[PDB]
């Protein structure tokens, strides 16, 4: 019976009065469609449940293929510790919202710990790796320690101008937590697999990140 994928997205919108965010739509929609095409059972969750806010910079070029993804985001499940089991993979799309509601969320930390402990696939794109910054194995070892990873880069963050409003810088912090960070050109498709941990750099990496998940799941048929 089919592999099962848990997708978890942000519900955060606030940075300053002049700067709002949310989920970066493509980072959910393109993976969701890939997983649905493969026949996987996908559970769509968010930190809060309900209707997920989209980063306004991410809603202007919606693909006609994204209709079902978009609709799924209007009525998400609220992430639970129960979601720590029953799934072959977890996938964390980005958007700057994640920097504010993923890193310190105890439910998500608990879920990622169990996925890691259990040898399942953990994938994240762009700011999605924020969910990993304070996630650990049971023994306290950071999940990213000694692992090859990518994320939205500090250079990309400085270019967009929002580095000064981030609680921490994601690439910097992942390296500080013990990750071996790697990247490609700003705004190019770059993703990496290190065993069970798969990461992508930016919106342009959404598809390749998802395809790495598919390949890892295909191995475990």
**CATH code where residue 157 lies:** 3.40.50.880
Experimental determination approach used: X-ray
Parallel, antiparallel, or unpaired: how do β-strands 14-16 and 19-20 relate? Answer: antiparallel
| Resolution in Å, one decimal place | 1.4
Give the number of domains in the chain: 1
Q: Within 13 Å of residue 168, how many CA atoms lie on the same side as its CB?
A: 21
| Alpha helices (H) along the chain | 25-37, 67-72, 98-101, 106-117, 154-160, 170-176, 206-218
Distances (CA, A) of 165 to 18, 45, 158, 186: 12, 26, 11, 20
Boundaries of domain holding 95: 1-221
Parallel, antiparallel, or unpaired: how do β-strands 4-9 and 41-46 relate? Answer: parallel
Say if residues 62 and 70 touch (Cβ distance below 8 Å).
Answer: yes
Phi, psi of 178 (to 5 degrees): 110, 5
Q: How far apart are CA 125 and CA 136, in angstroms?
A: 19
Q: How far apart are CA 181 and CA 144, in angstroms?
A: 10
Tell me how crowded residue 15 is: count the other CB atoms within 10 A of its CB: 16
């Amino acid at each position: 019976m089919s592999k099962r994928v848990l997708m978890v997205v942000t519900n955060h919108t606030t940075i300053t009065d002049d700067h709002k965010t949310g989920l970066w739509l493509e980072e959910f929609a393109v993976p969701y469609l890939v997983f649905q095409e493969k026949g996987y059972d996908v559970k769509v969750a968010s930190i809060q449940g309900g209707e997920v806010p989209l980063d306004p910079r991410s809603i202007n070029e919606k693909d006609p293929s994204w209709a079902e993804a978009e609709a799924a985001l209007k009525h998400t499940a609220r992430l639970s510790k129960d979601d720590a089991h029953g799934f072959d993979a977890i996938f964390l799309p980005g958007g700057h919202g994640t920097m504010f509601d993923f890193p310190d969320n105890e439910t998500l930390q608990y879920v990622l710990q169990q996925f890691a402990e259990d040898g399942r696939i953990i994938a994240a794109v762009c700011h999605g790796p924020s969910g990993l910054v304070n996630a650990t194995y049971k023994d306290g070892t950071p999940i990213v320690k000694g692992k090859t990873v990518t994320s939205f880069t500090d250079e990309e963050e400085r270019e967009v101008g929002l580095d000064v409003h981030m609680p921490f810088l994601l690439e910097s912090t992942l390296r500080l937590r013990g990750a071996n960070f790697v990247r490609g050109g700003k705004w190019t498709d770059f993703s990496v697999r290190d065993g069970n941990l798969i990461t992508g750099q930016n919106p342009q990496s959404s598809r390749s990140t998802a395809e790495k998940v598919v390949a890892a799941l295909e191995e475990r048929e």
